[PDB]
C-alpha cells in the first residue's frame, strides 16, 4: 500500500534485473520488473546496445508506467565512424569522423530532447560532442 | 615452545577435540607450526586459557606465515660446468640453458633443445632432476622458485668421466645461477574474498579492504544484503573476522579462496630479507 | 609616447634622485644636453614603451623630439633606473632593436619542451621614417630538436637587419622531468 512516484531511473539496454535501483524505488511501485526485459528488448532488439533512460510512474491501484528517452548522444556517433570507444585523448587523436551533414542528420534523431528548435544550434551540440570523444567533423 | 610442550599439546586436542568438535587442528603443510581453527576471537581465546592452564602447556601465540614464492623478471643464459679430472672417476658434466620468466601462474617447463646429441640421451633425465631440484631454495629467501620455462640448448661431455649424477649437478648449477642473475622477485599469496554485508556498512567495508593492500572487484546484490569480491595478501588479512564484524556490528560475514601469487611492492622486498 | 623632461644646469645629479626625479641626458651626432625626467611618468612609459617604440620628449623649449632609450643604467642592489640616455632620432637611417613576435604554436606544444626566446629583439636599421614593430616570426614546424635563426623573416619595406645573420634567434628544448637522476 506504499506511496506514489515519478521515478527517474537510468537502466541500460538488456540488463533488466529487479536488482536496485529497480528495487528500493520500484518496491513501492508493484512494478512488473520483468515486463520491461520484453517490452524494451523488443524495441531495442533493433539497436542492440546503448543505455535507455526511463521514467516509471506508479499510482494507487498498485500499477506502474514508464516512458523512455533517447540513447546517449555519444552512441550514434560511435557507429557513425566505425568506433566503439572515444579516442582516449580527445582533440589530438582522430580515430574516425563525421561530415557537416552526418552531424546534421543526428541532431534530427535527438532534436525532440535537447532544448533548441533548430539544427544550426542542435548540430553544434553534436559537433561539440565531437571533440568530446576525439572525432573530428568532416568538412 | 621446546619440543617438550609440543606433546602436552598433542594430548591437548586428543581430548579437547572430542569435548568440542567445533574446531579443527592442522599442521601447516609447509612449515611445522600448527593452526588452531576457531569460530570467533573469544573462541580460540578461551581455549588458550584451558589449553594453557588445564593442560599447563605454555607455547607461543602469534600469527601464521605466508607461503611465498621466488621467480625472476628478465630471461638469462649461463654456463653449467662441473668437470673434475684428476685421475679416474673423472666427473665431467656441463650444460648451458635458456631461462625465461613466465606469466604469474605458468608453472614448470623445460626444453630438450639438444641438436645432434652433444649431451648424451641417457643423461638428460638427470640434468632435469637437477634443475627441477635446485629450484627448491630460492635465491632470495629460500622458497619454491616457480613460474618459469627452462631451455637446455647446449652442453658437452666426456666418454668415460661423465655420470648420470655429474649432470644432475651441472644442470642444478645452471639454474642455481640464472635466477640469481635474472633479477629475482619475492612473489606472495593473493586470496579471493566475499564479504556479505548490508550496503549500510558497505561504505567503510570497502574502504578498510582497500587500506589492506587489496584491490576491489565488485558487488552484485543478494537478498537484502550485498556481496563484495576482491583480492588480498594473506599477511594483511589476519584476524579479519574481528574486523569485519567491526565494520558491521555483527551483520557481516565472509568467505575466502586462493587464486594466484604476485610480486611484493619492493618496499616489502628488503622487508622480507629476514 | 610622450614624457615631460627638463634641462639640467648640472647640479647634484644625486639631489634629484632624492628629489624624486631621474637624472638623464639625450644626444646624437649634433646635440647632447643633460636632462632629467620624473620617475612615475618614466616608469609608466618605459615600463611599456621600452626601446622599441620611440618616445617624443617635451622640453620647456617647445621642442618635442623623438628618441629611443639607447641606455638605462641601474642600481644593481635593488634596480631603480638611475640614469637614461635618449637618442634623438632624425631622418638618417639608424640602428635599433625591433621586437620579435612569436605568432604560432610549435610542436613542442603537444610533445613537450619549451620555446626559448633566445633573442626576442633584433638589431636592424632603417630611416626613423619607417617605424616597424613586432616583426612576426613563424613557428609551428618546430619540435624539441633543431631551431631557426639567420634572417629568415618578413623584412618590411626598407628594413635591412644588422646582425649576422647566423645568431640563434630561438630554439626549443627538453622539459625538466621530475623523474630523472644521473648522479649515482
Amino acid at each position: 500500500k506504499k506511496v506514489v512516484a515519478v521515478v527517474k531511473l537510468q537502466l541500460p539496454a538488456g540488463k533488466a534485473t529487479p536488482a536496485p535501483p529497480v528495487g528500493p524505488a520500484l518496491g513501492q511501485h508493484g512494478a512488473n520488473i520483468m515486463e520491461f526485459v520484453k517490452a524494451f528488448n523488443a524495441a531495442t532488439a533493433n539497436m542492440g546496445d546503448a543505455i535507455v533512460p526511463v521514467e516509471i510512474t506508479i499510482y494507487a491501484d498498485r500499477s506502474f508506467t514508464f516512458v523512455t528517452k533517447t540513447p546517449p548522444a555519444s552512441y550514434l556517433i560511435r557507429k557513425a565512424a566505425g568506433l566503439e570507444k572515444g579516442a582516449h585523448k580527445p582533440g589530438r587523436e582522430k580515430v574516425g569522423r563525421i561530415t557537416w551533414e552526418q552531424v546534421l542528420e543526428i541532431a534530427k534523431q535527438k532534436m525532440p530532447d535537447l532544448n533548441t528548435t533548430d539544427l544550426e544550434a542542435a548540430a553544434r551540440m553534436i559537433a561539440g560532442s565531437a571533440r568530446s570523444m576525439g572525432v573530428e567533423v568532416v568538412g | 615452545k621446546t619440543k617438550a610442550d609440543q606433546e602436552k599439546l598433542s594430548q591437548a586436542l586428543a581430548r579437547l577435540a572430542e569435548e568440542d568438535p567445533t574446531f579443527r587442528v592442522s599442521t601447516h603443510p609447509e612449515t611445522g607450526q600448527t593452526i588452531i581453527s576457531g569460530m570467533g576471537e573469544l573462541h580460540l581465546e578461551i581455549i588458550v586459557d584451558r589449553l594453557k592452564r588445564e593442560f599447563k602447556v605454555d607455547a607461543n601465540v602469534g600469527k601464521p606465515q605466508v607461503a611465498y614464492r621466488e621467480t625472476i623478471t628478465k630471461p638469462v643464459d649461463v654456463e653449467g660446468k662441473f668437470i673434475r679430472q684428476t685421475g679416474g672417476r673423472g666427473q665431467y658434466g656441463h650444460v648451458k640453458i635458456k631461462v625465461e620468466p613466465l606469466p604469474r601462474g605458468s608453472g614448470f617447463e623445460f626444453v630438450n633443445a639438444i641438436v645432434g646429441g652433444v649431451i648424451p640421451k641417457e643423461y638428460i633425465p638427470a640434468v632435469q632432476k637437477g634443475i627441477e631440484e635446485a629450484m627448491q631454495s630460492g635465491p632470495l629467501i629460500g622458497f619454491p622458485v616457480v613460474d618459469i620455462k627452462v631451455t637446455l640448448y647446449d652442453g658437452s661431455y666426456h666418454e668415460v668421466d661423465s655420470s648420470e649424477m655429474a649432470f644432475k649437478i651441472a644442470g642444478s648449477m645452471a639454474i642455481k645461477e640464472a635466477v640469481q642473475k635474472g633479477d629475482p622477485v619475492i612473489l606472495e599469496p593473493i586470496m579471493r574474498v566475499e564479504v556479505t554485508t548490508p550496503e549500510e556498512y558497505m561504505g567503510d567495508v570497502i574502504g578498510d579492504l582497500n587500506a589492506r593492500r587489496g584491490q576491489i572487484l565488485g558487488m552484485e546484490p543478494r537478498g537484502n544484503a550485498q556481496v563484495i569480491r576482491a583480492f588480498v595478501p594473506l599477511a594483511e588479512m589476519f584476524g579479519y573476522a574481528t574486523d569485519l564484524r567491526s565494520k558491521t556490528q555483527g551483520r557481516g560475514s565472509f568467505v575466502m579462496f586462493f587464486d594466484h601469487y604476485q610480486e611484493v611492492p619492493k618496499q616489502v622486498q628488503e622487508k622480507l630479507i629476514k | 609616447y610622450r614624457l615631460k623632461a627638463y634641462y639640467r644646469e648640472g647640479e647634484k645629479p644625486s639631489a634629484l634622485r632624492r628629489a624624486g626625479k631621474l637624472p638623464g641626458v639625450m644626444y646624437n651626432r649634433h646635440l647632447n644636453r643633460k636632462v632629467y625626467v620624473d620617475l612615475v611618468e618614466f616608469d609608466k612609459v618605459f615600463r611599456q614603451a621600452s626601446i622599441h617604440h620611440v618616445i617624443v620628449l617635451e622640453l620647456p623649449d617647445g621642442q618635442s623630439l623623438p628618441t629611443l632609450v639607447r641606455q638605462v643604467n641601474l642600481d644593481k642592489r635593488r634596480r631603480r633606473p638611475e640614469h637614461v640616455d635618449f637618442f634623438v632620432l632624425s631622418d638618417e637611417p639608424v640602428e635599433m632593436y625591433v621586437p620579435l613576435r612569436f605568432v604560432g604554436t610549435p610542436a613542442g606544444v603537444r610533445a613537450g619542451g619549451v620555446l626559448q626566446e633566445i633573442h626576442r629583439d633584433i638589431l636592424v636599421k632603417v630611416s626613423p621614417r619607417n617605424i616597424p614593430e613586432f616583426i612576426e616570426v613563424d613557428v609551428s614546424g618546430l619540435e624539441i630538436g633543431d631551431s631557426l635563426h639567420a634572417s629568415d623573416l618578413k623584412l618590411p619595406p626598407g628594413v635591412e637587419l644588422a646582425v649576422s645573420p647566423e645568431e640563434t634567434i630561438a630554439a626549443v628544448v627538453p622539459p625538466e622531468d621530475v623523474e630523472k637522476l644521473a648522479e649515482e
Binding site: - | - | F46, R47, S50, I51, Q71, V72, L74, D75, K76, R77, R78, R79, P81, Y97, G112, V114, L115, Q116, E117, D121, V173, P175, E176, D177, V178, E179, E183
Partner: protein, 141 residues
C-alpha cells in the same frame, strides 16, 4: 652536486663580500627570476637543494636556469685539532653571491607556478630573496 672540474689552485683565500654584484643583475633568459638581497656564500648543496625542489614542484615543467656557479673552494680543518700545521682540506664549494644578483630564473610556465617554485627555492637559500619579472631588463650587454 656541481663544481669546478679542473683548477689551478686546490685551495684559495677567504676574501670579503662587498655590495654591488658586478653583473648578472638582470634577466636575459627566462621570464621570472629570483634575486639575492643579502650578500653571502651559497654552497653547491644549497643550490642543488633548490634547483631540485624547484623542478620537483612542477614535474615536467619548462626550463630552469641556474645563473650562478660555485667555484670557490670551501676549506675546513679536521675535527678536534689545533691551529697551525698548514691549511685545511676542501669540504665543498660555494659561489660568492651579492645583492642584486640573479641566482635563478624560470622560463615557460604559468605565472602561478613560476611564482611558486621560486618561492620555495627562496626557502632553501640562507639569504632573503626577491622575485622579479622582466620589465627593464632590456639591454644589459
Amino acid at each position: 652536486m656541481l663544481m669546478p672540474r679542473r683548477m689551478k689552485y686546490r685551495k684559495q683565500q677567504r676574501g670579503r663580500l662587498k655590495g654591488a654584484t658586478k653583473g648578472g643583475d638582470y634577466v636575459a633568459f627566462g621570464d621570472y627570476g629570483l634575486v639575492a638581497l643579502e650578500p653571502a656564500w651559497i654552497t653547491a648543496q644549497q643550490i642543488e637543494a633548490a634547483r631540485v625542489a624547484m623542478v620537483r614542484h612542477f614535474r615536467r615543467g619548462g626550463k630552469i636556469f641556474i645563473r650562478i656557479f660555485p667555484d670557490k673552494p670551501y676549506t675546513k680543518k679536521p675535527l678536534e685539532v689545533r691551529m697551525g700545521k698548514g691549511k685545511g682540506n676542501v669540504e665543498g664549494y660555494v659561489a660568492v653571491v651579492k645583492p642584486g644578483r640573479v641566482m635563478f630564473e624560470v622560463a615557460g610556465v604559468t605565472e602561478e607556478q613560476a611564482m611558486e617554485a621560486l618561492r620555495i627555492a627562496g626557502h632553501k637559500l640562507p639569504i632573503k630573496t626577491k622575485i622579479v619579472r622582466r620589465d627593464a631588463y632590456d639591454e644589459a650587454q
